[PDB]
Write a protein that binds this ligand. Structure first.
Ligand SMILES: N[C@H]1CCCN(c2cncc(-c3[nH]nc4ccc(-c5c(F)cccc5F)cc34)n2)C1
Length: 273
């Protein structure tokens, strides 16, 4: 059962994603997150190998939860009469990248370089497992403050990775590529790289670059903060209006601005602790 397995604490959040409660596995005080969601509010269904009709979020999660990674992992789940309850990891102390930036203002480039890299590595992981997150942002990235490690969260907008076109999008708008805005059509990888450019700008500037459809499609990036020239270049390269002019993951990771990254543990010693 559940309540017998987990001792539910206070509500951590609630929204489209449902309601998230702080919790702890009784077996070993492991800190966990307990996410509840009503079936009636589930749009994207799918099924496990054994063919169980579960939320696509569960399918994906299970696919990226094997072994170590920068993705909060799904420990266990439960089906209820009118809802699904997922048991997910819970760093402690932890803080999402949104509040972190909101608190600290634009980040130092060395810190951003560390964070972004970890992000990239986690997205390459997801794609290896054939999963497309579809909603990468500072709100869906948690920071394990004592480790300096970032974890991806919220796969309820995700999709199985595919080489053909996507015509559905239910992720964050201002983070949506121009090709979706204009044509309602996009491809996995390249649309991902567009959101990774929004994120990078977001870190180094403290706020996303575009706000209106007009801005997203014009593709003009103005820097509100003092950013290195190498960094503005990588950012403008990810925000290339034409999907095929955007860099590949390997290209992003091989960008000058991305050399000499600090490992997590030092990132924490230097910028968090
Ligand atoms: N739109 C996003 C924004 C954040 C909440 N959302 C989701 C969606 N799917 C999984 C998890 C989630 N899985 N494990 C967790 C441990 C802590 C906290 C956590 C936290 F550290 C700080 C504030 C709020 C929190 F919810 C969340 C966790 N969270 C929706």
């Amino acid at each position: 059962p559940l309540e017998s397995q987990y001792q539910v604490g206070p509500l951590l959040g609630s929204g489209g994603f449902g309601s998230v409660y702080s919790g702890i596995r009784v077996s070993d005080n492991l800190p966990v997150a307990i996410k509840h969601v009503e079936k009636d509010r589930i749009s994207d269904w799918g099924e496990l190998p054994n063919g169980t009709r579960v939320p696509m979020e569960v399918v994906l999660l299970k696919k990226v939860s094997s072994g170590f990674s920068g993705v909060i992992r799904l420990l266990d789940w439960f089906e209820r009469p009118d809802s699904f309850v997922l048991i997910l990891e819970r760093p402690e102390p932890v803080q999402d990248l949104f509040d972190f930036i909101t608190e600290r203002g634009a980040l130092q480039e060395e810190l951003a370089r560390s964070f972004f890299w970890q992000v990239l590595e986690a997205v390459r992981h997801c794609h290896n497992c054939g999963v497309l997150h579809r909603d990468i942002k500072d709100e869906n990235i948690l920071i394990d403050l004592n480790r300096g490690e970032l974890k991806l969260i919220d796969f309820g907008s995700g999709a199985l990775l595919k080489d053909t076109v996507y015509t559905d999008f239910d992720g964050t708008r201002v983070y949506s590529p121009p090709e979706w805005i204009r044509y309602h059509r996009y491809h996995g990888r390249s649309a991902a790289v567009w959101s990774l450019g929004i994120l990078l700008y977001d870190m180094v500037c403290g706020d996303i670059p575009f706000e209106h459809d007009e801005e997203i499609i014009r593709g003009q990036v103005f820097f509100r903060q003092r950013v290195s020239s190498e960094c503005q270049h990588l950012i403008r390269w990810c925000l290339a209006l034409r999907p095929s002019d955007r860099p590949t993951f390997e290209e992003i990771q091989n960008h000058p601005w991305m050399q000499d990254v600090l490992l997590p543990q030092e990132t924490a010693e230097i910028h968090l602790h």
